[PDB]
Amino acid sequence: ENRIQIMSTIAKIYRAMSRELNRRLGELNLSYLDFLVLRATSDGPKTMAYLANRYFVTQSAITASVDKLEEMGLVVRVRDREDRRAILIEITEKGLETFNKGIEIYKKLANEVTGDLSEDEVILVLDKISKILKRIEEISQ
Amino acid sequence: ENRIQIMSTIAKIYRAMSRELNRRLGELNLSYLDFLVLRATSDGPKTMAYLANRYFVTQSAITASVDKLEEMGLVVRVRDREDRRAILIEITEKGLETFNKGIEIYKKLANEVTGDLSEDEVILVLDKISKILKRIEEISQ
Ligand SMILES: [Ca+2]
Ligand SMILES: [Ca+2]
């Protein structure tokens, strides 16, 4: 019924958004996934395992995105002073600058799509779907 | 602010749901995408182009899913009596039976994740995000 429609509508929204975001982020020379790696590392270094798990993508996909971001000078691979094997992906100043640009593109698009909604409506939906996310995350992992 | 959180929460929900659905649908010998092909063809034959576009996946991905579904006897490729090139993917009786089983798995999971919400809340969110979907679809294509 409605509970099923809520989830399928959520899925359709994500697909359309991801498609438009890849298009708009293309001007920053980034794909939606590349942007996600930047968003994840913008607040602290992340392990490649974390990146693949958090955003549900293959390790080869993350390796591909990280390699690209590294070539573009947006992130760097940091190794432990002793165990150089344990690797963290750290964002660069340039990476943060590009990320910030990505955020504004995301922000602009989000305003457009949520247009028909008032600040109140927006907040109502957010509080609610936030409970859905908490549950699926508790169930899926 | 909140408009950005709404979209990112929607994205996180989809990823967690898609992951759990692939797990649960695995018992029906299906992946989330296979289920989507069945859902799309359950109400009428669909072109492979439509399938790839509607669910934002590559044509090679759809070809892979359709080939599998065909081997499993869940769908068939129908050719025009004259132009045998124009191909439609039609669901089979067995395909509909499996689809129906998939729906119940989807339905069960949707009830769980939307648990903290009452029928009213569920409906409120649905009416709202439905407007978001209408807009992004108008913008993305
Ligand atoms: Ca758990
Ligand atoms: Ca348009």
Side-chain angles (χ1 to χ4, degrees), chain B:
Chain B
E1 188 175 57
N2 309 317
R3 290 166 189 283
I4 251 182
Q5 273 193 71
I6 281 285
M7 307 316 284
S8 61
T9 294
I10 280 173
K12 291 182 181 62
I13 288 175
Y14 170 76
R15 295 178 196 122
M17 280 289 293
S18 54
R19 181 209 292 289
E20 182 59 11
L21 281 175
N22 267 110
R23 191 182 78 74
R24 301 197 179 186
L25 290 176
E27 285 176 50
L28 296 187
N29 307 99
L30 304 172
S31 65
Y32 177 43
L33 172 62
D34 299 322
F35 174 67
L36 292 178
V37 167
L38 286 181
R39 197 291 165 222
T41 60
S42 65
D43 56 41
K46 300 292 188 296
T47 64
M48 291 189 94
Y50 167 84
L51 293 178
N53 184 300
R54 185 57 180 152
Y55 301 98
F56 189 48
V57 302
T58 57
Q59 282 283 50
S60 49
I62 291 301
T63 292
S65 180
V66 172
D67 279 2
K68 171 181 182 178
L69 287 178
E70 180 179 61
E71 177 57 31
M72 291 172 74
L74 307 190
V75 305
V76 292
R77 285 192 166 77
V78 302
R79 304 162 187 291
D80 175 61
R81 69 287 206 299
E82 284 182 353
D83 186 306
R84 62 178 301 292
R85 292 154 296 196
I87 290 175
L88 288 176
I89 306 306
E90 185 181 316
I91 197 171
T92 63
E93 177 188 293
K94 187 64 184 180
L96 279 176
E97 171 189 343
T98 305
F99 165 64
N100 284 160
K101 282 185 179 61
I103 278 302
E104 290 308 304
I105 289 180
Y106 194 83
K107 197 177 192 305
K108 177 175 302 180
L109 180 62
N111 290 329
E112 288 176 52
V113 307
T114 65
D116 306 302
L117 309 188
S118 64
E119 287 301 307
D120 297 309
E121 297 176 298
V122 176
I123 292 181
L124 188 60
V125 179
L126 181 61
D127 175 292
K128 310 269 177 293
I129 69 172
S130 166
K131 300 172 177 291
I132 296 178
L133 175 56
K134 182 179 188 290
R135 294 309 182 185
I136 180 57
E137 297 214 309
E138 296 185 321
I139 299 178
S140 65
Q141 294 193 66

Side-chain angles (χ1 to χ4, degrees), chain A:
Chain A
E1 188 175 57
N2 309 317
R3 290 166 189 283
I4 251 182
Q5 273 193 71
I6 281 285
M7 307 316 284
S8 61
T9 294
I10 280 173
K12 291 182 181 62
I13 288 175
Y14 170 76
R15 295 178 196 122
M17 280 289 293
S18 54
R19 181 209 292 289
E20 182 59 11
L21 281 175
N22 267 110
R23 191 182 78 74
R24 301 197 179 186
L25 290 176
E27 285 176 50
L28 296 187
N29 307 99
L30 304 172
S31 65
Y32 177 43
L33 172 62
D34 299 322
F35 174 67
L36 292 178
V37 167
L38 286 181
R39 197 291 165 222
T41 60
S42 65
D43 56 41
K46 300 292 188 296
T47 64
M48 291 189 94
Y50 167 84
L51 293 178
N53 184 300
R54 185 57 180 152
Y55 301 98
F56 189 48
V57 302
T58 57
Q59 282 283 50
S60 49
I62 291 301
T63 292
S65 180
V66 172
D67 279 2
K68 171 181 182 178
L69 287 178
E70 180 179 61
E71 177 57 31
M72 291 172 74
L74 307 190
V75 305
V76 292
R77 285 192 166 77
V78 302
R79 304 162 187 291
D80 175 61
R81 69 287 206 299
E82 284 182 353
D83 186 306
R84 62 178 301 292
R85 292 154 296 196
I87 290 175
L88 288 176
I89 306 306
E90 185 181 316
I91 197 171
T92 63
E93 177 188 293
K94 187 64 184 180
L96 279 176
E97 171 189 343
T98 305
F99 165 64
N100 284 160
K101 282 185 179 61
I103 278 302
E104 290 308 304
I105 289 180
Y106 194 83
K107 197 177 192 305
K108 177 175 302 180
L109 180 62
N111 290 329
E112 288 176 52
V113 307
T114 65
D116 306 302
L117 309 188
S118 64
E119 287 301 307
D120 297 309
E121 297 176 298
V122 176
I123 292 181
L124 188 60
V125 179
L126 181 61
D127 175 292
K128 310 269 177 293
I129 69 172
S130 166
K131 300 172 177 291
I132 296 178
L133 175 56
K134 182 179 188 290
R135 294 309 182 185
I136 180 57
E137 297 214 309
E138 296 185 321
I139 299 178
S140 65
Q141 294 193 66

